[PDB]
Amino acid sequence: MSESVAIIGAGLVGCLAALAFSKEGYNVTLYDFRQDPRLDTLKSINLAISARGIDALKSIDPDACEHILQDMIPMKGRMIHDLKGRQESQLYINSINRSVLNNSLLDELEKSTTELKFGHKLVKIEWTDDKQICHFAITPHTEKYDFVIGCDGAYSATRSQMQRKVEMDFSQEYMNLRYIELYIPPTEEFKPNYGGNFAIAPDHLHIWPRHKFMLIALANSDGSFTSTFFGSKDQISDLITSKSRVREFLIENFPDIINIMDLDDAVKRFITYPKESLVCVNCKPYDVPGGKAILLGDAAHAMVPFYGQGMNCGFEDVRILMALLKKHSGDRSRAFTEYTQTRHKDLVSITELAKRNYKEMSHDVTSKRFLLRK
Numbered sequence: 596m597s598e599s600v601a602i603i604g605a606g607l608v609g610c611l612a613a614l615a616f617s618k619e620g621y622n623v624t625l626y627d628f629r630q631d632p633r634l635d636t637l638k639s640i641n642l643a644i645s646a647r648g649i650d651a652l653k654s655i656d657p658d659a660c661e662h663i664l665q666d667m668i669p670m671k672g673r674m675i676h677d678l679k680g681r682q683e684s685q686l687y688i689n690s691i692n693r694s695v696l697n698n699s700l701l702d703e704l705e706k707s708t709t710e711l712k713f714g715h716k717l718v719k720i721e722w723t724d725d726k727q728i729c730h731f732a733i734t735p736h737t738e739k740y741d742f743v744i745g746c747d748g749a750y751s752a753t754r755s756q757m758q759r760k761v762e763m764d765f766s767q768e769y770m771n772l773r774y775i776e777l778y779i780p781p782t783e784e785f786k787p788n789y790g791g792n793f794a795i796a797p798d799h800l801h802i803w804p805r806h807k808f809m810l811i812a813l814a815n816s817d818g819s820f821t822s823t824f825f826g827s828k829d830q831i832s833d834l835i836t837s838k839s840r841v842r843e844f845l846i847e848n849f850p851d852i853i854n855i856m857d858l859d860d861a862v863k864r865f866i867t868y869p870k871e872s873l874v875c876v877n878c879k880p881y882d883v884p885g886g887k888a889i890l891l892g893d894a895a896h897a898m899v900p901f902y903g904q905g906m907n908c909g910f911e912d913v914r915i916l917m918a919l920l921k922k923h924s925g926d927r928s929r930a931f932t933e934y935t936q937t938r939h940k941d942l943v944s945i946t947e948l949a950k951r952n953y954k955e956m957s958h959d960v961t962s963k964r965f966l967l968r969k
């Protein structure tokens with residue numbers, strides 16, 4: 596007597612949506628074309644989960660959520676590093692490992708009635724007034740579902756299938772921005788004032804704001820920090836023609852990382868950093884009329900890294916949707932319709948504060964404390 600749902604994509608948002616719909620009693624099947632990540636056979640290593648992200652997770656799986664979330668490191672504020680290495684504490688997010696979080700969600704799903712189908716690529720959907728026929732490559736295969744949830748990322752195959760059934764406003768924009776993953780190792784000895792082998796304070800998000808480029812650092816449980824450099828494709832491509840050019844760039848702009856980061860390794864991470872396509876995506880509506888499908892996460896609204904908070908937004912997507920389904924007593928057609936109306940309102944504002952955040956933190960940086968004169 597239960598309805599079936601296909602959830603396309605077992606990233607962070609797909610796993611959470613599957614937990615939520617299995618909890619609510621739907622017959623959930625969760626698809627991904629990738630292999631089970633938990634086998635020996637990630638856009639970042641540790642990520643920040645916000646209070647709102649945590650609450651979404653809590654609303655959906657209260658039991659698991661504390662087990663899922665207790666290696667996470669609470670951040671009390673941001674620490675701003677200037678060109679002279681001065682650090683300013685600005686008191687207020689929690690640091691958590693991406694792979695660990697994704698795997699824990701998969702583990703919780705295994706305790707559920709959810710069917711996990713890895714190595715299944717959605718290629719086509721036939722939409723009807725009854726069940727939706729999902730075509731997979733696994734070897735073509737079809738399966739029928741009462742409805743479909745697209746959690747399949749910025750390039751959503753689901754979204755493209757939906758566009759055939761509904762008139763969807765849609766935009767994609769490839770941003771100039773690139774990011775490079777850097778690493779700050781644990782210290783040799785335990786540091787009492789920090790509560791671990793941390794080179795710098797682990798209870799702050801560290802930010803080295805510069806003019807249209809930036810370094811950040813976020814603590815990992817083992818004392819290390821996940822660090823990320825952000826800059827334009829042109830700036831980075833201009834730098835990495837020369838190892839010496841990269842090295843001197845880092846020393847000049849981030850002098851207080853020289854002692855805590857392997858600069859020779861950092862240079863190599865710059866030079867050999869892989870091809871990236873950061874794309875921003877928006878669309879309207881998020882649903883196929885009659886409750887037949889809905890888009891959550893990056894599939895609905897891929898946004899700019901750091902200035903936007905995509906995982907947190909996607910987690911909030913799921914919480915909002917479940918509350919609407921409950922408000923409508925399981926009427927998916929009316930719930931999905933209200934979801935697209937109210938979420939789009941939210942997301943224009945979210946995109947609004949993201950750009951404003953870009954403006955104050957990275958565009959408007961000309962002070963002598965933050966911009967070098969040479």
Ligand SMILES: Cc1cc2nc3c(=O)[nH]c(=O)nc-3n(C[C@H](O)[C@H](O)[C@H](O)COP(=O)(O)OP(=O)(O)OC[C@H]3O[C@@H](n4cnc5c(N)ncnc54)[C@H](O)[C@@H]3O)c2cc1C
Pocket residue numbers: 603604605606607608609626627628629638639641642643644715716717718746747748749750751752753774891892893894900901903904905906907908909
């Ligand atoms: C460097 C970086 C750091 C970030 N850090 C943070 C952070 O700290 N906090 C935060 O809030 N956000 C962060 N974000 C954003 C966050 O990573 C994303 O918003 C989020 O992971 C998107 O989750 P998702 O499940 O919607 O999509 P995805 O992670 O893209 O997963 C989609 C899944 O669908 C699968 N799939 C795709 N197509 C198909 C198909 N046709 N058939 C079957 N399966 C398919 C894919 O294999 C994939 O597993 C970061 C982004 C970047 C670039």
Ligand SMILES: COc1ccc(S(=O)(=O)Nc2nc(-c3cccc([N+](=O)[O-])c3)cs2)cc1OC
Pocket residue numbers: 639641642643644673688800811812813821822823900901902903904905949951952953955956
């Ligand atoms: C470890 O690397 C990452 C860590 C965290 C995140 S995040 O998704 O959680 N983004 C976040 N931005 C802020 C933030 C701080 C101050 C000013 C502003 N502002 O936009 O004005 C935003 C805190 S957390 C992303 C990362 O890589 C992209």
